[PDB]
Amino acid sequence: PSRVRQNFHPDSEAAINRQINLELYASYVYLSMAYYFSRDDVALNNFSRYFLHQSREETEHAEKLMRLQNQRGGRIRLQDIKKPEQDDWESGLHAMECALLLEKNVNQSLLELHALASDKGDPHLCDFLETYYLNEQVKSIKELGDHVHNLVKMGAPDAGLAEYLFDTHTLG
Amino acid sequence: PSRVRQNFHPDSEAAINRQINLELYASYVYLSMAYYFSRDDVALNNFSRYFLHQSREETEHAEKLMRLQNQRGGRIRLQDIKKPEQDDWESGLHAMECALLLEKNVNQSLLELHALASDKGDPHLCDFLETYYLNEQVKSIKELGDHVHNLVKMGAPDAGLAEYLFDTHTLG
Amino acid sequence: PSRVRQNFHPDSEAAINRQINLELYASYVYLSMAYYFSRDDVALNNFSRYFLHQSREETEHAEKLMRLQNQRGGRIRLQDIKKPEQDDWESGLHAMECALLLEKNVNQSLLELHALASDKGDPHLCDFLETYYLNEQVKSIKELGDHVHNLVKMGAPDAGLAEYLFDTHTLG
Amino acid sequence: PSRVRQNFHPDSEAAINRQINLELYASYVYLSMAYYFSRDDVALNNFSRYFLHQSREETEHAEKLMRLQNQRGGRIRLQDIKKPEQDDWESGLHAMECALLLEKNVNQSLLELHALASDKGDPHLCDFLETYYLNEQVKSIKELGDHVHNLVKMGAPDAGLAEYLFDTHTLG
């Protein structure tokens, strides 16, 4: 093994590689959403900026796991980054609801990773997830829930002023 | 009696202890309201901030009466702080209407305290109430009346944009 | 359930509501102590300031749990805040000893909450307690133990200079 | 009458002249105390400074009443300023206890003046007393009560370190 490797189970190494792919996938989904909102027939520039920011954060989530792999003496194994489920995200509300589902799916993956690290007696990996990932996910899910609630109450997507005003106020 | 006590009737001392409890109760009601508005299914962050500010002001109202008790040589007697009437405050409009009723009830208690201080020939206590409490209550009741009127006219709670826009403009 | 809720057991939600009440109770105990020390027949202004500061910290402990409840999609359920065990706290030493007992009781409640979160496989809640509560309690208990030791050694409460000098030096 | 005089009863004018004399008397008592504490066989320089400050405040209390008399169209009538009851004030504790008795006697005089102004339907004079005198007296009596309590508990006047340490800490 690597002369740095210590208390680092091969199953943990493999699960970190799968999580890297999921974070890169999330970045790509948010990039897709960002450029949907800058279409001439959508033109919600603060929705665009919001999702572009989220995309860049997901790349940093991927990089911190890649750094962890190297720190612990594992070997990064990259896989294809699947295209998102849609190019046409339909509305500001629909994109927010899809983001919320994505963030809960990423959270479930992180909770499974934490359970595996716990089973393998890897407190360093548990602390890493608890310090950089699990509260970030709770905050992200709460923010998206807030946004979905306001957009639904305002009458999105069919009420003509709702997404326009949410874009200016909340995302401005 | 306390070597500081002078012209301070036991009935005034007792009424000050009851007012301390009412101010602490008002703080708790406003704390409850603040955290209702930060629920994921309410998510009106400026309503939240408004009521949190009101909560902290009520604690200062309680503390100034506690200080008065000590200044005059009375003895503070604390009682349970009752839970608010609701955890679910229903809407921005309903919370504002409940706040308005609370502030008029607190005002009536202060007016009764002033009448008692007058009956007991306690001009220091009358001046204390007139300087720190009675105009504060008039201003608070007027502000809440303004807010209720605007929210009703805008169509709250059922008009989808009303509480959202009041939160951004008036409470922003 | 709330569209944000994930891996959040109803027993954890209920235990968080009980902890909120205990933090609000601790705030009230420390408020009582603060205003005992500003009585004309006690007049230890730095003891007063010390306990007032502790009171305000406990309100922030309550608020962070209220925020956690909302973040995780639980529902805050407030209860009466019981009055403290005493209005007359007897001496600087006695108040410090009562504070030490309170902080150990709050610590035991937090340790039980951590054990419950562990049993329910809630690493987010475990990390929250470990990050914001458990070391805060250890530091608070140690500080109060230091203060009790010095006051006992100095001869409090009966040695006429002891609480006066502790107030000026240690709490000044 | 004076072309300014309005709603100003001769009994109020006379009571203001008596209060002017009492404030000038209080200034003289505090001047006496200040210079007792700078004797070579007393030499408590912060007790001296404390009472000198109180003396100068009493002169300002006298001047504000003299200004009120002129503002309302009354005529100032000065009388002898009686010497204080003692040149030898015995101890720091005894001077503080005598100051406390003086301030309660001045407070009783002000409360009688307020009752007279009330009987004569003079709200300007009532407000003047409530704004500049009655809370000043409550604060002064409370401070002196605090000081007396600490000096008694510390063992003054017989405990050799008590007045020395109170002078350095509390009055420093």
Ligand SMILES: [Cl-]
């Ligand atoms: Cl290994």
Ligand SMILES: [Cl-]
């Ligand atoms: Cl592949």
Ligand SMILES: [Cl-]
């Ligand atoms: Cl693949």
Ligand SMILES: [Cl-]
């Ligand atoms: Cl472990």
Ligand SMILES: [Cl-]
């Ligand atoms: Cl909703």
Ligand SMILES: [Cl-]
């Ligand atoms: Cl607008």
Ligand SMILES: [Cl-]
């Ligand atoms: Cl009395």
Ligand SMILES: [Cl-]
């Ligand atoms: Cl009770």
Ligand SMILES: [Cl-]
């Ligand atoms: Cl009760």
Ligand SMILES: [Cl-]
């Ligand atoms: Cl009166």
Ligand SMILES: [Cl-]
């Ligand atoms: Cl209306």
Ligand SMILES: [Cl-]
């Ligand atoms: Cl605007």
Ligand SMILES: [Cl-]
């Ligand atoms: Cl759940």
Ligand SMILES: [Cl-]
């Ligand atoms: Cl209850």
Ligand SMILES: [Cl-]
């Ligand atoms: Cl209860």
Ligand SMILES: [Cl-]
């Ligand atoms: Cl766990």
